[model samples]
Structures are given as structure tokens and as C-alpha cells.
Target: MNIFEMLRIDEGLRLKIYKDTEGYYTIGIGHLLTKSPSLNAAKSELDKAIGRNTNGVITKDEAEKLFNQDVDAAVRGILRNAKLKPVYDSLDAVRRAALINMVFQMGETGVAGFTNSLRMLQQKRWDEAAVNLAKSRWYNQTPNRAKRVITIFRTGTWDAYK
Candidate 1:
């Protein structure tokens, strides 16, 4: 009926990547997503899967471009959603960027798990929110990223994260 439906038909719907009947690693819409055709296999299938039969690999630049688009979308979602509404416009640039970057890296659902931290953010308690964020699973999983985010939350310095 439409473009998305067209894709849904040929590609099929899957949240996680899976092996197509042809034994290729695929996800979403038949995009090659892994070296192993199955989840039990080792290695990540980051590159090599934009379209079926196009190639076995995709360039780093291409991946980055795709990521940028998704990250921007995440930021826009944060701006418009009611959950983070109170603080989105009020936060300083870097702090706001840190919030958006969290959504970019973790997805909105993942970042949303920091319930107390987000509440602190809405309250404008930068240091408190930083401390709470340091105590999250996301922080443990990505310590360096949490460190940079915490620093931004505390200082709100523009471009200091580099």
C-alpha cells in the first residue's frame, strides 16, 4: 500500500537481527547486520548490511552518517516528549546536548531508566543528577561516557567534552 508496507512485506518485521532463509545475517528490513547468521555466533555485524546483495561491507563514513541522522531524531523526540519537557528548553547548551547524547547512545527507553536522575534534571539539580547518573547501570556499562556526561551536567561547558 505504501513504502513502509512494501518494505514490511519483503523484509519482514524483526526487532533483533535474524538469519534469512538464505542464511544471511539480516535485521529490520533484510539489512545485513552480523557476521554470524544467527545470534549464537560471535562477532558484531556493524558494517556490511545496508541493502541485500549490494556488498559485504559498508564504509565507516556511511555508518556515521546514518548514526547522525538517528541521533538527531532522538534529540527531536526528547524536545517534543512530555517526559523531559520541563528541562529541555531550560538546560544550558552542553547539558542539553548531554541529555540528547544520552538518548542518542542509549535510546529514549534506555535513558529513561534513570528515573531519579531525570527528575533531578527537571529540578535543575545538576550535581545531584550527575551523582545519580553515576549510580546507574548505563554508567557501569559505559563509564567513560557517563563521566563525560556527568561533567557536562555539572559544568554545562560547551564543547568541553572533547
Candidate 2:
């Protein structure tokens, strides 16, 4: 089964992935479901949030409810901007997934603010990308989580499964 299916997210929840007052995205199930309604809800919310953000699509109320007023509109606005399109498009599936996971833990703006990391990724500098990822404030915040994700992006292998 696919990862989401393995996580029991059939319909997928529409969660906003990011670390802040709302929640943080960790490697394990517990972290993802911290304040979420259910496992499915968390997955769905995360998927939808990342999918929409990466694709530059935003549903008014849907995006709004993901965070408080201070960040909600700005996050959606950033997602809707055209300047960020190329960066999103240039990302490989693994890198994109990793970014989504990071964003889920770090909040949209915080993740977006990774200017150096984004540059490294756009230049196809895998080592630099990995290193830049490790430099984040959330790096040691969840060591296991960061290691697992960075492994997936670097070697394309996560404990024998791709």
C-alpha cells in the first residue's frame, strides 16, 4: 500500500502542516495527530495543505482555518503568488515531499523563508540541500524525524524501502 494508505488516510485530511501554535509535523504518527481530529484528518489536512500550497491553489475558508489570522492570509497569499511557481515546479518528488513535511513542521512562511535551501535545491546541489535542511531551527528539534526525511531525500532509500 502507498504511504498514505498505510497511514489509513483514504480520503486524506486537509490539514495545514507547520510548526507553530497550531501543531508540528513529526516523523511518527503521534506528532502529526497532535491537535488533529483523527489520523485521517491529520493526513488529509496535511496533504491538502501541501498540495494546494505547492500547486498555488487556495480555497478561502479551507486555507483560513488551518492557522490563526496572523498567518493564515499571508500563507495563502504566498501560495497564490507567481514568483514561487518555478521553485515549486523544479522540485523533485522526494525533495517536494521533504519540503512539504518540513513545512508541515515549520509553518508555511517559515518553510518558505528557507531562501538558501531553496537555492541549493534549485541548483540541484543535493549535498547542499541536505546540509541546508539540517541547518533549520527544527533540525535537532526532532532528530529522528529529520534524519529519516533527509535519508529519503539523499539516498532515495528509507530503511530499505524507497
Candidate 3:
């Protein structure tokens, strides 16, 4: 018989616009309310999805499985687009995962403008790749997360942010 073990027991099911541990607006299991356009874009979309400060509940089995394709979308998206395709396909999984995370945060079109980072990556210039990431406006948007990504880019180690 299948053991039916829970992958993450605590975050198993929910139907609420809950604030994340990081204190950002979030919903469902862990959908970080974000948008490529702006934070207002995220807010407005979330308003449409669920009224502000809404509260509800769902059993793990009852929760809709509609939005759980993030990993698939992120990884496949990096490989699908021509801009990041070659680079993404050539990199190891961890490195590609970091870039996929960026693509998830920024839209496909948004990430295309990172020419300097891409060049550094193509040259296998790890430190330069990290530096290029820090130099971007998105770095300003998520400095700590970006630092972790940069550390991964430079060292191939998934170290925690300081």
C-alpha cells in the first residue's frame, strides 16, 4: 500500500490570503503574490483572486491543484525560449535552477535584458556572473535572495544568505 506520506505536513493545505514568513502577501500553499509589472499588479490580481484579508480553509485533498506547476513552468520556460535556451540547456541543474528562479521572478521578456549576466555566464566567469546579477535593478528588488543566487552562481554551492 502507498504510505501516503506528507511531503510537508505543516503547509499541506489552506485557502487564505496569509502573510508569508517573510511578511509578504501570499496565498494558498505558498504562492508569493508577485507580478512582473509591479507590486500593485500583484495586489490587484490577488484582489481578484481572493478579497483582501480573506480567510478560508481546505483539506489537503480538497485544495485545488491549479497552481502547483511553478517548477515545471520555470524549468521548461528557461529551456523553451531561444534567448536563455542555449545557456540554460548547457548549464548544470543547480545553475539552471537559479536562472529559472530568476525567470520565475522576472518574466521571460524581463530577463532578456540581462545581457551582461548572460555573457559572463557563457564565458564561465562565475564571479562576473555574480557581480552582473548584483548590478541589476532586480537585485535592488530582492537583495538578499539575489545575493544567495549570486553565491550559487559563483561557487556552485547552495549556501544560505548572510
Candidate 4:
């Protein structure tokens, strides 16, 4: 599968606002509308995205738009990292998608904190890289998703996509 399809499955789509694992006000495909943890200023952004005051609802098209924008930002985040760019470029497409999938959720800064993992990946030490990620809090926070991403990293394939 492509990055979009893989992410759609990993992130899941929600046309209405909902509480994420961390209890933040989120909408679309795992989009965090809130600047902070609480719902403080989320409604305004949600309404703007929906183009109307539906309270917490959005159209599928609108959610898709948000997903695209977020994915673009994730991709750029990965490419813009001097430390990550070369490592990212060295990977095959499936492995690249796995990295993008990670950046989509954790942000570039968060993933960059995985110094050992990136080093393993940079050297094509797939299994070691996967082990590094599995040892992180990100894995603890979202076990199933982390498992899938780890599998992608380990095998450099779309096996986990199934």
C-alpha cells in the first residue's frame, strides 16, 4: 500500500471530534486541533475547517483535506531534517513510508530523539532499529501501531499493512 493508505489504516479517520489516547481534542485523521491538552481553542479551528459551526463535526472531504495537509507536513519534516534526510533517502519506498508514518504521529523532533534507532537505521541495521523503537515510550503509548511500524522497519516491507 501507499503512504496515504497505510496512514489511513494506522491513524483512522474521524469526521467528528473525539478524545485521543492522551485525551486531547482531536479530529480528522488524528489531527490535534488543540494547542494544549484541553479543548481550550479547538472549536474555532474545527469550525473553520468544516466551514460552518457544526460544533464538532466535519465532512469526509474536509477531513481528507486535513489529512493531506498533515501528511505533507510530516513528509517535509522528515526531509528537512539534516540528520534524517540522508538516512531517509537510503531506504526503499516501503521503509520510507514507515518512517513517514512514524513522523506523522510523533513529529520530526520526537522521532529525532530516537538517536540510537536512527543510527541503526542509517546503517541499515533493520532489526536493531526496530528494537530501539520498540523500547520507546511511543511503543508503550500505542503498542499495536508501534508493533506494525516496527515490523515495517524490521522487514522493510508492507507485511504489517495487512
Q: Please give, for residues 1-162, the per-residue lDDT of candidate 4 as tens digits.
A: 899999999878988788888777889898888757555468887887667877778889889988999999998998999877887998888999988988888789988888888889989998878888889899999999999988988997788888
Weakest ten-residue segment in model 3 by summed lDDT: 1-10
Backbone collisions counted per model: 1, 11, 0, 0
Model 1 Cα shift for residue 36 (angstroms): 10
- CA-lDDT, candidates in order: 0.60, 0.51, 0.60, 0.86
Ranking by TM-score: 4, 3, 1, 2
Comparing 1 with 2 on TM-score, the higher-scoring candidate is 1
Candidate 1 TM-score, C-alpha based? 0.64
Give candidate 2 regions above 4 Å deviation.
Answer: 1-84, 157-162
The digit string of per-residue lDDT tens for model 1 on 1-162 reads 222222233344454545664466654434444455455331244333343333334444554444445556777778777676566777776577777767755557777667788888878898888888898777786576578667878887743433
Which candidate tops lDDT?
4
**Top candidate when judged by TM-score against the true structure:** 4
lDDT of 2: 0.51
* Model 3: lDDT of residue 143: 79
Residues 65-153, model 3: lDDT tens digits: 42445445666777777888877866776676567667755657778679878878877899878887798787886676677667767
TM-score of each: 0.64, 0.50, 0.65, 0.93
Q: How do these models rank on lDDT, best leading?
A: 4, 3, 1, 2
> Candidate 3: what lDDT?
0.60
lDDT score, residue 19, model 4?
Answer: 81
**Which is better, 2 or 4, measured by lDDT?**
4
